[PDB]
Design a protein around this ligand. Structure first.
Ligand SMILES: Cc1cc2nc3c(=O)[nH]c(=O)nc-3n(C[C@H](O)[C@H](O)[C@H](O)COP(=O)(O)OP(=O)(O)OC[C@H]3O[C@@H](n4cnc5c(N)ncnc54)[C@H](O)[C@@H]3O)c2cc1C
Ligand SMILES: Cc1cc2nc3c(=O)[nH]c(=O)nc-3n(C[C@H](O)[C@H](O)[C@H](O)COP(=O)(O)OP(=O)(O)OC[C@H]3O[C@@H](n4cnc5c(N)ncnc54)[C@H](O)[C@@H]3O)c2cc1C
Ligand SMILES: NC(=O)c1ccc[n+]([C@@H]2O[C@H](COP(=O)([O-])OP(=O)(O)OC[C@H]3O[C@@H](n4cnc5c(N)ncnc54)[C@H](OP(=O)(O)O)[C@@H]3O)[C@@H](O)[C@H]2O)c1
Ligand SMILES: NC(=O)c1ccc[n+]([C@@H]2O[C@H](COP(=O)([O-])OP(=O)(O)OC[C@H]3O[C@@H](n4cnc5c(N)ncnc54)[C@H](OP(=O)(O)O)[C@@H]3O)[C@@H](O)[C@H]2O)c1
Lengths: 303, 303
């Protein structure tokens, strides 16, 4: 009944949906939230070719704009499972079932947790995984940012708009982030570093965070320092629970595809951040999405 | 002396160059012509995520804009060859030589010729491979477009701005173009079709084209019909002459890569339309470019 159902309306899904709709495939695009995916949790995007710098939620709106005029059917849905019935597939959401000849899984990735004490307790109250969401709550605070990748370092630079200082705590002595971003952080006067360190405990009063205990990974030295907020950027986990049974995931839970976005299962493709891969960017999301869309067209044509 | 040299400044090269420069790689971007590649020969781009519709040369300018501020060194060059000297590579242009640790080949593809009589003779004078370049010379003419793919059909739709009529001659009875574009052509009153036909001869007076002879591929029926211009869109050939010796090309001349944009030769990558692949779009150009850029960074880091 659908030719293709795309699950997730971040940039990979949105590109896939634009491409399938342009091939006049009967196209359903399911999204649990706001179109844009991670781009809506991104302050400034500088490396999407075509735009010099653009705010994440604006790029999200621009990518979403044409979809309805192309005849993509946009619908709310949280997908909880997928069943392979051979020559069609069923997709289960909270309240619905959808039958389709093909599926493109574009559900992305989620913030990895520290799994330390205080992290859950202070969730609403000092602990954050999203600087554009929460930064303004931390005006004039000493902010801590955990991680040494692109997100940690970019989000620390963004947060300097609000905080008195932002400290980046990284578990080695060399950042993973792109050098251009490293350099901007090195030069920014409101950015401090705690190198070779990991957080051990987030502590507070029963209302909000007050301090963090951490440890040096070369010496075991333990320090406790006051902070008013902590933003955590220690990597990603896959958003793929709805296929855990199906035999298309690696040991960490990422969806395995070949180079044409194909899983094990004929007619189920996966694109973007949810796939097993190293390089997670909007460029490769868009690329993957277009490729899967063309593979779904051919699969459905042949069916 | 360069960390990376990218050859060609279409969207794949431009994305690669943006990414390498952001990793602070000493980056040279060589282009024989105008930045933009094929996008500058494209009238309206509707399927680049982020833009609802944009003229090709404008998207070209937007992609080129940030490169110099990122420290990409933009230079004129027609590359004629590449030598692998093990731990560095040399690139030869008309007048220069460049030494680099890595190379990303982003030189794209060129219009395939019909290789029929009149095609060369009327090159300047009725025969064209570029509608945005030449269309306005054909105002009120009966224009012929050869091919049944995305280019033929889109470029025929564009040309209806100028011609009295545009006829699309395709060698089968079903177009290859995206269905949305097929449908727009079917509905457009100024588009006619000559199905199941191939051109045999382009004829004219010693000044300009006047007629085309063609043949029906199911019956052998031969027809000659008057036209004032012919635009040819019968597919692509690789632009890779400068590596023909090197053992990285297939029998048709496309550059073979794995899924990380790697050739046989360590430190030489290839991206975008020049690669052996099926799906040639700006989305997959940009994707390939970003991936190669990250692979070049790692290669150079390890060297
Ligand atoms: C802080 C930050 C800054 C970044 N900055 C950049 C940058 O500047 N440049 C860049 O190239 N990349 C950047 N990235 C990476 C980029 O955002 C991602 O690579 C990209 O968004 C991945 O797109 P996607 O479509 O695969 O997944 P996502 O954008 O994650 O979209 C997945 C979508 O699936 C939906 N979804 C998930 N589960 C379900 C379900 N069960 N049912 C229905 N819908 C569901 C989600 O709501 C989401 O909208 C950044 C990432 C972060 C966190
Ligand atoms: C008429 C038309 C319409 C199109 N419309 C669309 C569309 O709407 N959407 C879409 O997604 N795709 C479209 N495409 C496809 C898209 O343009 C290409 O996929 C894309 O431009 C490929 O980018 P690239 O960087 O790999 O190669 P290119 O854009 O071809 O760029 C290659 C560059 O290399 C340079 N170069 C070549 N040889 C050398 C040399 N020896 N030394 C130095 N420089 C050199 C060239 O001058 C060129 O600038 C269209 C194509 C055509 C022809
Ligand atoms: N501008 C952009 O293009 C952009 C922006 C944001 C994100 N992204 C992409 O999105 C993907 C995810 O990025 P990310 O930065 O969110 O994750 P990431 O690349 O996995 O980086 C996580 C960082 O946190 C470190 N870390 C992990 N645990 C830690 C701990 N317990 N204490 C201190 N530091 C810890 C990691 O250390 P190690 O380095 O030792 O592993 C790493 O440096 C990447 O592929 C990235 O390039 C891109
Ligand atoms: N909007 C976009 O995304 C867009 C726009 C333009 C181009 N592109 C991409 O760029 C790539 C190249 O596109 P293209 O259209 O230039 O080439 P293409 O996909 O190779 O299509 C060429 C068309 O011409 C036909 N043909 C070949 N020889 C012929 C002859 N002698 N007489 C009549 N018809 C003949 C082919 O026939 P058969 O079909 O029988 O082979 C085919 O239909 C494609 O991958 C395409 O999708 C994309």
């Amino acid at each position: 009944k659908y030719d293709v159902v795309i699950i997730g309306s971040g940039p990979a899904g949105m590109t896939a949906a634009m491409y399938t709709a342009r091939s006049e495939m009967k196209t359903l695009l399911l999204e649990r939230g706001v179109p844009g995916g991670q781009m809506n949790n991104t302050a400034e995007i500088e490396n999407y070719p075509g735009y010099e710098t653009i705010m994440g939620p604006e790029l999200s709106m621009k990518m979403a704009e044409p979809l309805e005029g192309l005849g993509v059917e946009n619908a709310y849905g949280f997908v909880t499972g997928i069943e392979d019935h051979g020559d069609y597939k069923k997709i289960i959401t909270e309240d619905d079932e959808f039958i389709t000849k093909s599926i493109i899984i574009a559900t992305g990735a989620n913030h990895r947790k520290l799994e330390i004490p205080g992290e859950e307790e202070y969730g609403a109250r000092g602990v954050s995984y999203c600087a554009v969401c929460d930064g303004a709550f931390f005006r004039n605070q000493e902010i801590l940012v955990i991680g040494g990748g692109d997100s940690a370092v970019e989000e620390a630079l963004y947060l300097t708009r609000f905080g008195q200082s932002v400290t980046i705590m990284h578990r080695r002595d060399k950042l993973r982030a792109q050098e251009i971003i490293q350099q901007r952080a090195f030069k920014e006067e409101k950015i401090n570093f705690i190198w070779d360190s990991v957080p051990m405990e987030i502590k507070g009063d029963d209302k909000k965070i007050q301090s963090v205990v951490y440890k040096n990974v070369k010496t075991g030295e333990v320090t406790e320092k006051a902070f008013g907020g902590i933003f955590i950027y220690v990597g990603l986990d896959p958003v793929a629970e709805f296929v855990s049974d199906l035999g298309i995931t690696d040991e960490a839970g990422w969806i395995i595809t070949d180079d044409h976005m194909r899983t094990n299962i004929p007619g189920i493709f996966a694109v973007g951040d949810v796939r097993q891969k190293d390089f997670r960017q909007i460029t490769t999301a868009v690329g993957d999405g277009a490729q899967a869309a063309q593979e779904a067209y051919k699969f459905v044509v042949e069916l």
